[PDB]
Amino acid sequence: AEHIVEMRNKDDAGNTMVFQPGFVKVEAGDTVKFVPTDKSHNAESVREVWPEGVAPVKGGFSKEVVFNAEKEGLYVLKCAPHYGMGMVVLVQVGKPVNLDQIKEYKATGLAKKRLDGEIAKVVQ
């Protein structure tokens, strides 16, 4: 099953530099497509927290990119120019096996706020 995450300058609630949705639950074999609804964004792995051994994602600037969900766990992506403004997304593939490690990751500021909100949506 395919899931879409839009790259947006603003959502309708007023939040700026957002992935919409900011949390998505998927199953192995699903794809997650990050689409440039607004230009000047990307989606790429936060490599410092990306699951061990799983191929990273690095989309081009203003381009669509896919995450091929395969191994169970939690996957954090950022928008490179807007990470500090909070533009972060959390994809859960199946069981959230690495939840402790995602909670241990030190984000700050707006990424911390937004990632914490996303972590709270994890399905256990």
- Residues belonging to the binding site for Cu cation are 41, 79, 82, 87
Q: Could you say which residues in the range 85-104 bind Cu ion, by CB under 5 A?
A: 87
Q: Sheet holding 2-10: strands in order across?
A: 16-20, 2-10, 31-35, 65-68
Cβ neighbours of residue 68 closer than 8 Å, sequence gap 6 or more:
31
**Residue in 76, 79, 93, 119 binding Cu ion, rule: CB under 5 A:** 79
Question: Applying CB under 5 A, which of residues 19, 23, 26, 41 lies at the interface with Cu ion?
Answer: 41
Output the smallest distance, CB 1 to Cu ion, in A. Answer: 25
Member of 8, 78, 82, 114 binding Cu ion (CB under 5 A)? 82
Strands across the sheet containing 73-78: 23-26, 88-93, 73-78, 44-45
Interface with Cu ion (CB under 5 A):
41, 79, 82, 87
